[PDB]
Amino acid sequence: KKIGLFYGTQTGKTESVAEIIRDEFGNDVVTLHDVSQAEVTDLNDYQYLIIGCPTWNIGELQSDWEGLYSELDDVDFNGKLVAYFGTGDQIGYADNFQDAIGILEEKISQRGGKTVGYWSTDGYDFNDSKALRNGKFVGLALDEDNQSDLTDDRIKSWVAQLKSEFGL
């Protein structure tokens, strides 16, 4: 009803985590939007947003999201609070781990969005990332290929953090 969660997914992991995030928030607070069936103008309807996008393209963005990216200039995000999460492989993409959410954040904050939900890089083994803001990632970094046993606990901690930041 109040937080719009827009995700794009390739193998379905970002979508399953989006449903978990939805449940952790509860009370009909978050409405899920698969970006394959969304329009950029749908983002304008929320004052609270959660952007989900995996990184599997070594120097490109998830197809569904790749499309919306070009039209992100058509939307004013000033006043909106935005959080980010994505899936990736810190070993197979050591130099580009979670690049997708960093690209998205750069664009959105330029348009006026305020990033909420920074997440610690501790416990990850990678080299670089466009999502790296230096001591923290721009949002929740998940790795189901190497750290699937840490996923639910990470989601649990991040949602508790977002509850405070979003004022829930």
- Which tokens hold the place of 43? 């983002």
Q: Give the span between the Cα atoms of 51 and 106, in whole angstroms.
A: 13
This PDB structure is determined at a resolution in Å of 2.0
Q: Where are the domains of the chain?
A: 1-168
- Cβ burial 80-103 (10 Å sphere, 16+ → b, else e): bbbbbbbbbbbeebeebbbbbbbb
Experimental technique of record: X-ray
| Packing angle of the helix pair 99-110, 63-70 (nearest 10 deg) | 20
How many beta carbons lie within 10 A of that of residue 54, not counting itself?
28
Taking domain 1-168, whether its CATH number is 3.40.50.360 is answered by yes
- Can you say how many angstroms the Cα of residue 116 is from the centroid of all Cα atoms in its chain? 11
Q: Give the span between the Cα atoms of 82 and 76, in whole angstroms.
A: 13
DSSP-derived secondary structure for 52-66: E----STTS--HHHH
DSSP-derived secondary structure for 15-53: HHHHHHHHHHH-TT-EEEEEGGG--GGGGGG-SEEEEE-
